[PDB]
Amino acid sequence: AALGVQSINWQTAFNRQAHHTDKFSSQELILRRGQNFQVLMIMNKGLGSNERLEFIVSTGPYPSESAMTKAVFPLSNGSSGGWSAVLQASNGNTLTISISSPASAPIGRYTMALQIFSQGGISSVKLGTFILLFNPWLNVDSVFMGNHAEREEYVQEDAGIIFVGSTNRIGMIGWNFGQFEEDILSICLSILDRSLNFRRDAATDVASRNDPKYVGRVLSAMINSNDDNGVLAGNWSGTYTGGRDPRSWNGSVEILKNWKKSGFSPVRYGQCWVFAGTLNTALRSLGIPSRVITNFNSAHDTDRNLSVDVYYDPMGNPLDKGSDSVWNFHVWNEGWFVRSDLGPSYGGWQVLDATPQERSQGVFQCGPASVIGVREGDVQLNFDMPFIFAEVNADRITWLYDNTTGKQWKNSVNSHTIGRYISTKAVGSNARMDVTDKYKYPEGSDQERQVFQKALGKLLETEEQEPSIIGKLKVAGMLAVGKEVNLVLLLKNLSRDTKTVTVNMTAWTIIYNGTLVHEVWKDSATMSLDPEEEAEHPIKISYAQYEKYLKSDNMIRITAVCKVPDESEVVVERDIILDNPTLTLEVLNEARVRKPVNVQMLFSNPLDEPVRDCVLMVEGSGLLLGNLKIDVPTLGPKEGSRVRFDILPSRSGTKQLLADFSCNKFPAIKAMLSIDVAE
């Protein structure tokens, strides 16, 4: 015949193992750019000497050789930059062929065809398709990450930890990233095919998928619903009718599947750690090494001056006033790549944030921002550095406002409080790794103030005597939903005179971002104090008082505004978090791959009332497929539930089982169990 191809062997399993893509649950050939793969191609005869083959690869709807979304390359003896195919051996009619892409190739799905020149004729045959990802193993790839252990954490690990809580009590939730789970890589690639950029100009978008800066910024937009019907619809209202309480999610898997299967319609509802977990999945799936960051006391600066305003009334109510805010924490991501746009001192970790806060070039997106650049205060560099710098290091101004007079006055400036205990999961363990010193110079240093002035640069008060009165709120005993709250306010008089202190106190339930929900308690007190006398004032809030307005955040904001005659107010502030009841998971046998293992959940109702509508949701990559739901019967007061269920480990290694227990009185109780799966 004319020379024609009979069959192709992609040697998928071998190539996937060599390309570090073997973990994805998928049949497809998944490869990493800049790295060869070997195929065997069986022809109808041996190659004639007036015969030639060309490979053609293309990605996207408008492939172009000049944009590098199409390449045409001969089967040669040599590699010549770009894409190449080397005939490694002929044996009969079988060709052993090593194909390789350039390190600068666009990521995504590709088609491969073969063009045959034979007997003066030209024929073309589609060979197959493959997925090409970024290559953090390859020294010349922009996403290169040289350390083995760190690549394992930041690319290959599908279970993680996100720090939450407050500066008074840092806690953690597990998160199932689940980048290897069925359809997740495919869904993450679909994200790119649905952005506003792709819809506007697919040819340019696809060509730009060689750039982790670009893919990273696209994902920061597309993970939020705003503008583009992307993945997650945000809600910080405390009312989650029509969707899941943001705290009930345990991973990215069901979110991404629910988006796709609904016809790419937003999933309801997310808060910041939910956006971050989901963005983390997408980054790791596409091969940008990434991790999740939590910033405590995180500032939302809306007017680009690196200062945020918080307001109280003289009766000690927090006020919702001014666009700016301070969150108990905010979660975002870092991606690992060089910054060809900024230069060599600014590569490494880059902030990316899918939480819709500020528009950037018209669109709710954020980053990439060099972490190094933020610490040095080079806030003129792309992208979104003013906003990010304020999040970790705004100054905070406390104001009194009295709407009866219309007067506002400045109480205090606090230049140390924003940006604390910036945290990420340690490599290879669940320890908390503090990265504040990467984002800022130390609080209290000359450097920190110098950098603040520099940053400010790029984008009358009378100081009174030191207050006579100092105060602080302290917790007495346990904080637990169902139990009363006991606090002490401690005041001390440092002046030389006796002082009479008038104290106005409130407690407000809040969302973790500072959204005020409802007042649940308020008192006033008057305390006469001798020079140097310290005194206490007990504060008691019953279950009945908070039960109706406490949200899944379990947060109460307590405030004491203290005043003596002829001195400015002192504001004493404490946010508390109440513990959920204990929820435990245990495995009753050792976990071995492919063998069922019985798990046990224990939960005790601490209330004197029954709990109803009890649901256990469980998931964990490598331990079960998808999300198990178990209806649990109504629990009488002080009664315990014991629920047993099987799981079926599918991979060996250290895996993470997550559970959410929800009922009418306790939304979103969380449990996590590390499970060692043996071969």
């Epitope: 009718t241 029509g242 969707g243 299967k261 609904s262 016809g263 509802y269 998808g626 999300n627 739901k629």
Partner: antibody, heavy 122, light 111 residues
Framework: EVQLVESGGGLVQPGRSLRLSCTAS????????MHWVRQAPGKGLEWVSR????????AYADSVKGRFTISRDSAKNSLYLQMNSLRTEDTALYYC???????????????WGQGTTVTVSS | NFMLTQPHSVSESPGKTVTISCTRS????????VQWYQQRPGSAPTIVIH?????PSGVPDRFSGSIDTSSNSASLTISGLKTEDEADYYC?????????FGGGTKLTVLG
């Protein structure tokens, strides 16, 4: 447990109107889309209509579009189907169904009522 | 829009495994979730599979669902058949508007 109770079914003449009602209990009504599905005696299930959790998105089977109107009422935890211009072919058992999905626009019927019978004949 | 096509009937003996297919006429079967329902005579349908392959509370682990991209079909598979499994079964999916049911399959457990 979820309970859905349909009512309003009966014998009625081609061209007249009938209103079905479904009362829902044992779940948060406003969290979920709701559906009507019908089944002619000894035949298959035919979806009729869906209404979204917030009533802002509604869909109809082609076979009923223009003639039937779905609606719901939060305070009464109830779903309705106004059926006008009936036809002998509309004869069926009419089931009320709660959607499975919470927080996404996918559709499935986790709980069904026992249905209310509609016979259309002159 | 699309249709879902199921076999009119299937049958197998007690203790064996049987499979009911559900083929989508256009668009990909994996674009949208598939549910399965059982219906006994005189009774409303009950859900046996949701979200392609998840099992509700109370459904025996003998019931499983799958998706096969190559045939553009979903399948309900029942192992260890018992006489009580004799019933009608329906598949269901949707697009962003409309809900689509399969035409139903009578499963006979051969007696």
């Amino acid at each position: 447990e979820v309970q859905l109770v349909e009512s309003g079914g009966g014998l009625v003449q081609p061209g007249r109107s009938l209103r079905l009602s479904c009362t829902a209990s044992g779940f948060t009504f406003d969290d979920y889309a709701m559906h009507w599905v019908r089944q002619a005696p000894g035949k298959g299930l035919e979806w009729v209509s869906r209404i979204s959790w917030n009533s802002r998105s509604i869909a109809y089977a082609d076979s009923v579009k223009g003639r039937f109107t779905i609606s719901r009422d939060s305070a009464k935890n109830s779903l309705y189907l106004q059926m006008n211009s009936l036809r002998t072919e509309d004869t069926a058992l009419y089931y009320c169904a709660k959607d499975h999905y919470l927080g996404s626009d996918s559709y499935g019927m986790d709980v069904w009522g026992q249905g209310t019978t509609v016979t259309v004949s002159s | 829009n699309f249709m879902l096509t199921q076999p009119h009937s299937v049958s197998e003996s007690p203790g064996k495994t049987v499979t009911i297919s559900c083929t989508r006429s256009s668009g990909s079967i994996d674009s949208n979730y598939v549910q399965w329902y059982q219906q006994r005579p005189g009774s409303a349908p009950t859900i046996v599979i949701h979200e392609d392959n998840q099992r509700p509370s109370g459904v025996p682990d003998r019931f499983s669902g799958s998706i096969d991209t190559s045939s553009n079909s979903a399948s309900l598979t029942i192992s260890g058949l018992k006489t009580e499994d004799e019933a009608d079964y329906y598949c269901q999916s949707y697009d962003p508007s409309n809900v689509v049911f399969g035409g139903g399959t009578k499963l006979t457990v051969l007696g």
